[PDB]
Design an enzyme around this catalytic site. Structure first.
Site, PDB file in Angstrom:
ATOM      1  N   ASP A 268      12.947  -2.041  55.644  1.00 18.60           N
ATOM      2  CA  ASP A 268      12.407  -0.709  55.527  1.00 18.60           C
ATOM      3  C   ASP A 268      12.856  -0.106  54.052  1.00 18.60           C
ATOM      4  O   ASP A 268      12.902   0.968  53.799  1.00 18.60           O
ATOM      5  CB  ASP A 268      12.534   0.179  56.446  1.00 18.60           C
ATOM      6  CG  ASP A 268      11.380   1.115  56.635  1.00 18.60           C
ATOM      7  OD1 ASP A 268      10.473   1.137  55.904  1.00 18.60           O
ATOM      8  OD2 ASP A 268      11.577   2.168  57.436  1.00 18.60           O
TER       9      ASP A 268
ATOM     10  N   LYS B 129      16.823  15.198  57.791  1.00 21.27           N
ATOM     11  CA  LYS B 129      16.252  14.777  59.354  1.00 21.27           C
ATOM     12  C   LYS B 129      15.063  13.912  59.192  1.00 21.27           C
ATOM     13  O   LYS B 129      14.648  13.431  58.044  1.00 21.27           O
ATOM     14  CB  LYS B 129      15.550  16.115  59.648  1.00 21.27           C
ATOM     15  CG  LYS B 129      14.504  16.272  59.001  1.00 21.27           C
TER      16      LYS B 129
END
Ligand SMILES: CNc1nccc(-c2cnn3ncccc23)n1
Length: 338
Positions: free
Chosen positions: A153, A33
């Site tokens: 990122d 998640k």
């Protein structure tokens, strides 16, 4: 009630174990998640294989972030049909119950999970080298002109193992990525891994990803982040402790120089260890048995080995993005095996 009862108050789909979708997928369980939504393990009954499905939040900003990601993955997987360049493979996508869903090959743990499994003491220099060679090969592929993709990122959490028992990896999460050309994002990169040119408000290119990689590789071997700033000023000061004051020709052109520095014509910090006195040589333990002295008496960790690793890392952490080492030459460096 949210989405006719299918969603929670966080815009996420409420997972149901064993649910069948589209006369095709049997959902098994949640396996990951994040900000984007959820990742489930599911059986693809048509292709007779387990897959991971990334279920994007039902909210326009998250949908549009994932539409950018789908376009970049389709462009990449297309120019690497043999899957030899260490980027996750997107099999297909679809809309289901108001969620965009991305179907991938199934992968294992991320590299932060691996660091936790070492009790934050680091992986060996030999395993660090294997991860480094794969990551540099991926950055070489992203730099091919038809791609020109900046990941934007990179960090341990966005690198996954293929298998728990083995060293093979894939890069994930292209939601914040962009392509060389028009400058769009000025605020980019997670803070610990953020390059000096971004901190300084200067133009940037694919070299920002090589900066992040240098930071990641030190952390994989020591167990802890190299530059753990609490805010941008603390981040720049932690970089300066290790690497010294940036060159004057850079600061003279930096829109945000005076957020951190003051101007002999020479530049100094605004009112930490003195600049450049926290040596990478000592963070790595080149002559003193590795990080924490814990590699003393182990094979695979000689002084000569550590000097080659230090040399490569310092080239990845060059302040000047024009001279920072590029993927082709990183792969030729003597740290890597012939
Ligand atoms: C967790 N297992 C897993 N297995 C396969 C793919 C992914 C994945 C793909 N893209 N992203 N983006 C972010 C996080 C995970 C992922 N994940």
């Amino acid at each position: 009630v949210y989405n006719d009862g299918y969603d929670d108050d966080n815009y996420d789909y409420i997972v149901k174990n064993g649910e069948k979708w589209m006369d095709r997928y049997e959902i098994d369980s949640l396996i990951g998640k994040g900000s984007f939504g959820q990742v489930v393990k599911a059986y693809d009954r048509v292709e007779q294989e387990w897959v991971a499905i990334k279920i994007i939040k039902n909210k326009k900003a998250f949908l549009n972030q994932a539409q950018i990601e789908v376009r970049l993955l389709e462009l990449m997987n297309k120019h690497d049909t043999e899957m030899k360049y260490y980027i996750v493979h997107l099999k297909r996508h679809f809309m289901f119950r108001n969620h965009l869903c991305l179907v991938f090959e199934m992968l294992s743990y991320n590299l932060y999970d691996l660091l936790r499994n070492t009790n934050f003491r680091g992986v060996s220099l030999n395993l660090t080298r294997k991860f480094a060679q794969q990551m540099c090969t991926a950055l070489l592929f992203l730099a091919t002109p038809e791609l020109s993709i900046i990941h934007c990122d990179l960090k341990p959490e966005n690198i996954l193992l293929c298998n728990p028992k083995r060293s093979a990896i894939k890069i994930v999460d292209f939601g914040s990525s962009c392509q060389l050309g028009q400058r769009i994002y000025q605020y980019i990169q997670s803070r610990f891994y953020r390059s000096p040119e971004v901190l300084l408000g200067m133009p940037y290119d694919l070299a920002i990803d090589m900066w992040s990689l240098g930071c990641i590789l030190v952390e994989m071997h020591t167990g802890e982040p190299l530059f753990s700033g609490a805010n941008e000023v603390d981040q720049m000061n932690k970089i300066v402790e290790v690497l010294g004051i940036p060159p004057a020709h850079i600061l003279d052109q930096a829109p945000k120089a005076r957020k951190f520095f003051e101007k002999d014509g020479t530049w100094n910090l605004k009112k930490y260890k003195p600049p450049g006195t926290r040596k990478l040589h000592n963070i790595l333990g080149v002559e003193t048995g590795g990080p924490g002295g814990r590699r003393a008496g182990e094979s695979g960790h000689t002084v000569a080995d550590y000097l080659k690793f230090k040399d490569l890392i310092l080239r990845m952490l060059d302040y000047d993005p024009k001279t920072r080492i590029q993927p082709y030459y990183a792969l030729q460096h003597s740290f890597f095996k012939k």
